[PDB]
Design a protein around this ligand. Structure first.
Ligand SMILES: *C(=N)[C@H](C[C@@H]1CCNC1=O)NC(=O)[C@@H]1[C@@H]2[C@H](CN1C(=O)[C@@H](NC(=O)C(F)(F)F)C(C)(C)C)C2(C)C
Ligand SMILES: *C(=N)[C@H](C[C@@H]1CCNC1=O)NC(=O)[C@@H]1[C@@H]2[C@H](CN1C(=O)[C@@H](NC(=O)C(F)(F)F)C(C)(C)C)C2(C)C
Lengths: 302, 303
């Protein structure tokens, strides 16, 4: 038993991390097959980042302007192209440690593991949930750009995030591996607003099932609710509306515990209106929305 | 910026995880050079675990009774020995992925990453802190025994923990890599009590420094207390007494923020005496003692 925020084993991703330097700017790159993917602001000087014209900046660069280092060995760049906010550097050597992979675009509420890197070297691994406003609460310092987010399904690494920036609220923003930002953000050093966040309801419910599986039951009772009436309470407390699709996704956890989804919704509705009154659920004094139903099934059944 | 509970990259350890089967019991082993380390209770049937005589149970096992698998490759067992609560199986092949390593015994308050494994396959990584009563709050299911805890210092993997059991309270217990349990626990299926816990004061202070480094300053106040006065408060709220050695270990964080340890102790004194009043620090509604000063320094620099 026990319930802990857990990251995927990072080994397969560690074998893909490289260092990319363009002039005075160094960041991380992801080496898959003969291509190194990295944030395009590697071509910027400090002043360029205030209002960069990336197409003009890239025209000024040639293959020899990109220093790519895999450990202590230099990889020769033989081609370069910009795709959205990502740079693709064709190298003359295919990564012998390339795992089976795919590039995916994730949705709000979904989680992924981040392998935080500096100078092409891995420093730590932690889990992130993509917020309703397309930001993540990570841990990223200077030089962390190009660090990636991923999920692993047995032997296949699904890359979903690449780190680009930190917003004025301390939250983090980035792109998918095709260079498209999650959210309304741009890679320019200018003040940018993230939308209002909303709590990921299906995830809070998933965590309440993880708590039940671990021995917590005080929030449980014979009360129930319609989907419509729970959604009125959800709007008041800034929670996402629960849909039949979300109820369906919670089915496996509901079957495992014998507690119907709308029965757990009645419990959640009560926790928001009445509060916890001095107690902790799974070591937390707050309701947590950073775990998906799949993250819960991963630790509470298999 | 941003402060997060973080595990070490696990690649080096993933390359050492194997599956160990003895009869109907399967768990994980750690393959270093030509030796596989695993919990000795792999030799037990479910009935044996209630009151095992490990010496007699092992005498009835031969090398052929142990099946060790690395991926889909059988590693032939050519020798077996028991050291405390660990079984050491000598195999016919040296692990070509053996990293540079040490076996260390950690103290309460110290942290490590656990690479949770099932059937010799790593499934997840998370950080654990060794509590004052020598237990950890982990996430371990059936077949997780043999999963290890470790710290990485650049290229060297310091293995400090091997998982063995879960206590009636839901907390977890295990041994160092020499098979000596942390705490008063024995590897027998019998109710065992963990000590009363005490909060790790120096870790709470390190986490308050992490909070200030990340813009969380509401709890900072204009007062500076003394070590003696802080210790009067700590003994009332079940916190460890702060020592000069602990103040010394906090030096780098105190220097990086320009906030003296006794200025931060006055913030902690006020948080304990007045409570957090429903307010949060680094997203938490509770004071956290799961981070060492080294974890805060390592993370806030980007080692
Ligand atoms: C990439 N290595 C860094 C990662 C940043 C550094 C501090 N924390 C992080 O996560 N990315 C940047 O420095 C990007 C980069 C220029 C500016 N920048 C920012 O993240 C800045 N933020 C913004 O300007 C904002 F708010 F719009 F997101 C900074 C003020 C430095 C935090 C570019 C090209 C966006
Ligand atoms: C090894 N794979 C498991 C890991 C356990 C399974 C559930 N969560 C865990 O951490 N270890 C065991 O099954 C050990 C093993 C016999 C019994 N045991 C326990 O963890 C039991 N606990 C105890 O008897 C206690 F309280 F003393 F710790 C159990 C009731 C199954 C949780 C031996 C040899 C200790």
């Amino acid at each position: 038993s026990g319930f802990r925020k857990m990251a995927f084993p990072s080994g397969k991703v560690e074998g893909c991390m490289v260092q990319v330097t363009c002039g005075t700017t160094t960041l991380n790159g992801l080496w898959l097959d003969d291509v190194v993917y990295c944030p395009r602001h590697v071509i910027c000087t400090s002043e360029d980042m205030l209002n960069p014209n990336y197409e003009d900046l890239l025209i000024r660069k040639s293959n020899h302007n990109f220093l790519v280092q895999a450990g202590n060995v230099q990889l020769r760049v033989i081609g370069h192209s910009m795709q959205n906010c990502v740079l693709k550097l064709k190298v003359d050597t295919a990564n012998p440690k390339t795992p089976k992979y795919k590039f995916v675009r994730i949705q709000p509420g979904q989680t992924f593991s981040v392998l935080a890197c500096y100078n092409g070297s891995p420093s730590g691994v932690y889990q992130c949930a993509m917020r309703h406003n397309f930001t993540i609460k990570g841990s990223f310092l200077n030089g962390s750009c190009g660090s990636v987010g991923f999920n692993i399904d047995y032997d296949c690494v699904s890359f979903c995030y690449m780190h680009h920036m930190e917003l004025p609220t301390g939250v983090h923003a980035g792109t998918d591996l095709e260079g498209n930002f999650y959210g309304p953000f741009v890679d320019r050093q200018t003040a940018q607003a993230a939308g209002t966040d909303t709590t990921i309801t299906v995830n809070v419910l998933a965590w309440l099932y993880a708590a039940v599986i671990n021995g917590d039951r005080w929030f449980l009772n014979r009360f129930t609710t319609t989907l419509n009436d729970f959604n009125l309470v959800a709007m008041k407390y800034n929670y996402e509306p629960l849909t039949q699709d979300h109820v369906d996704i919670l089915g496996p956890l509901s079957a495992q515990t014998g507690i119907a989804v709308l029965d757990m919704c009645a419990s959640l509705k009560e926790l928001l209106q009445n509060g916890m009154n001095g107690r902790t659920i799974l070591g937390s004094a707050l309701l947590e929305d950073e775990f998906t139903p799949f993250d819960v099934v991963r630790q509470c059944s298999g």
